[PDB]
Design an enzyme around this catalytic site. Sequence first.
Site, PDB file in Angstrom:
ATOM      1  N   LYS A   7      -2.487  -7.105   1.022  1.00 56.94           N
ATOM      2  CA  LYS A   7      -1.401  -6.203   0.722  1.00 56.94           C
ATOM      3  C   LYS A   7      -0.494  -6.112   1.968  1.00 56.94           C
ATOM      4  O   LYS A   7       0.732  -6.112   1.875  1.00 56.94           O
ATOM      5  CB  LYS A   7      -1.896  -4.862   0.270  1.00 56.94           C
ATOM      6  CG  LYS A   7      -0.770  -3.852  -0.039  1.00 56.94           C
ATOM      7  CD  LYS A   7      -1.388  -2.549  -0.460  1.00 56.94           C
ATOM      8  CE  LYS A   7      -0.368  -1.409  -0.466  1.00 56.94           C
ATOM      9  NZ  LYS A   7      -1.097  -0.169  -0.849  1.00 56.94           N
ATOM     10  N   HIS A  12       4.616  -6.761   4.424  1.00 58.33           N
ATOM     11  CA  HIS A  12       5.197  -6.729   5.756  1.00 58.33           C
ATOM     12  C   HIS A  12       5.477  -8.040   6.413  1.00 58.33           C
ATOM     13  O   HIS A  12       6.186  -7.993   7.447  1.00 58.33           O
ATOM     14  CB  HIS A  12       4.377  -5.827   6.683  1.00 58.33           C
ATOM     15  CG  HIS A  12       4.159  -4.419   6.196  1.00 58.33           C
ATOM     16  ND1 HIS A  12       5.240  -3.554   6.108  1.00 58.33           N
ATOM     17  CD2 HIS A  12       3.046  -3.787   5.749  1.00 58.33           C
ATOM     18  CE1 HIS A  12       4.739  -2.429   5.589  1.00 58.33           C
ATOM     19  NE2 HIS A  12       3.433  -2.527   5.381  1.00 58.33           N
ATOM     20  N   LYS A  41      10.231   1.880  -3.525  1.00 61.85           N
ATOM     21  CA  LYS A  41       9.547   2.310  -2.236  1.00 61.85           C
ATOM     22  C   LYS A  41      10.664   2.703  -1.302  1.00 61.85           C
ATOM     23  O   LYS A  41      11.618   1.876  -1.139  1.00 61.85           O
ATOM     24  CB  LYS A  41       8.810   1.077  -1.733  1.00 61.85           C
ATOM     25  CG  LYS A  41       8.025   1.297  -0.494  1.00 61.85           C
ATOM     26  CD  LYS A  41       7.216   0.149   0.105  1.00 61.85           C
ATOM     27  CE  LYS A  41       6.172   0.695   1.087  1.00 61.85           C
ATOM     28  NZ  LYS A  41       6.077  -0.005   2.386  1.00 61.85           N
ATOM     29  N   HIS A 119      -2.252  -1.623   7.708  1.00 60.93           N
ATOM     30  CA  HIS A 119      -1.175  -0.661   7.511  1.00 60.93           C
ATOM     31  C   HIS A 119      -0.180  -0.839   8.645  1.00 60.93           C
ATOM     32  O   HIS A 119      -0.552  -1.024   9.775  1.00 60.93           O
ATOM     33  CB  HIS A 119      -1.808   0.733   7.499  1.00 60.93           C
ATOM     34  CG  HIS A 119      -0.962   1.892   7.787  1.00 60.93           C
ATOM     35  ND1 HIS A 119      -0.179   2.480   6.835  1.00 60.93           N
ATOM     36  CD2 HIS A 119      -0.811   2.567   8.985  1.00 60.93           C
ATOM     37  CE1 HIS A 119       0.453   3.489   7.429  1.00 60.93           C
ATOM     38  NE2 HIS A 119       0.082   3.568   8.742  1.00 60.93           N
ATOM     39  N   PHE A 120       1.051  -0.665   8.309  1.00 68.82           N
ATOM     40  CA  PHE A 120       2.204  -0.684   9.303  1.00 68.82           C
ATOM     41  C   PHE A 120       2.477   0.768   9.566  1.00 68.82           C
ATOM     42  O   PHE A 120       2.936   1.518   8.661  1.00 68.82           O
ATOM     43  CB  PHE A 120       3.404  -1.405   8.700  1.00 68.82           C
ATOM     44  CG  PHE A 120       4.465  -1.652   9.759  1.00 68.82           C
ATOM     45  CD1 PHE A 120       5.379  -0.670  10.045  1.00 68.82           C
ATOM     46  CD2 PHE A 120       4.458  -2.867  10.415  1.00 68.82           C
ATOM     47  CE1 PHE A 120       6.333  -0.877  11.056  1.00 68.82           C
ATOM     48  CE2 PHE A 120       5.442  -3.095  11.419  1.00 68.82           C
ATOM     49  CZ  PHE A 120       6.304  -2.076  11.721  1.00 68.82           C
ATOM     50  N   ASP A 121       2.282   1.207  10.815  1.00 74.41           N
ATOM     51  CA  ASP A 121       2.452   2.611  11.163  1.00 74.41           C
ATOM     52  C   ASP A 121       3.813   2.937  11.624  1.00 74.41           C
ATOM     53  O   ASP A 121       4.393   3.924  11.184  1.00 74.41           O
ATOM     54  CB  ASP A 121       1.392   3.005  12.183  1.00 74.41           C
ATOM     55  CG  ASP A 121       1.140   4.498  12.159  1.00 74.41           C
ATOM     56  OD1 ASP A 121       0.862   5.073  11.104  1.00 74.41           O
ATOM     57  OD2 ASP A 121       1.252   5.206  13.183  1.00 74.41           O
TER      58      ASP A 121
END
EC number: 4.6.1.18
Length: 124
Positions: A7, A12, A41, A119-121
Amino acid sequence: KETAAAKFERQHMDSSTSAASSSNYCNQMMKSRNLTKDRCKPVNTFVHESLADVQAVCSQKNVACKNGQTNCYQSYSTMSITDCRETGSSKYPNCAYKTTQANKHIIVACEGNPYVPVHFDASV
């Protein structure tokens, strides 16, 4: 079902381009990556680097994520990124975005074995 690692890649990564080449980049990519299937999104970041370089961030500077978790990592180097932000005219299913190019350090959350970004923070 799709893994969190997969994902991350889908949402990303864009190793195929060095940077966004036109104002339509975000519109095109958000759609092609299936980010607008259920809803628009609101924000997203694409990274224009090799997957190996991004995976390597998991062994870089440990930092607290925005939510307080301690599995976040900040890249030592700046990376070529594209920021996508929903415009005032965006209306599902016709999601619309503004494309912004930047060169910033990235912060990702990592998990698993192999230990990879999930995850992209943030970009700083």
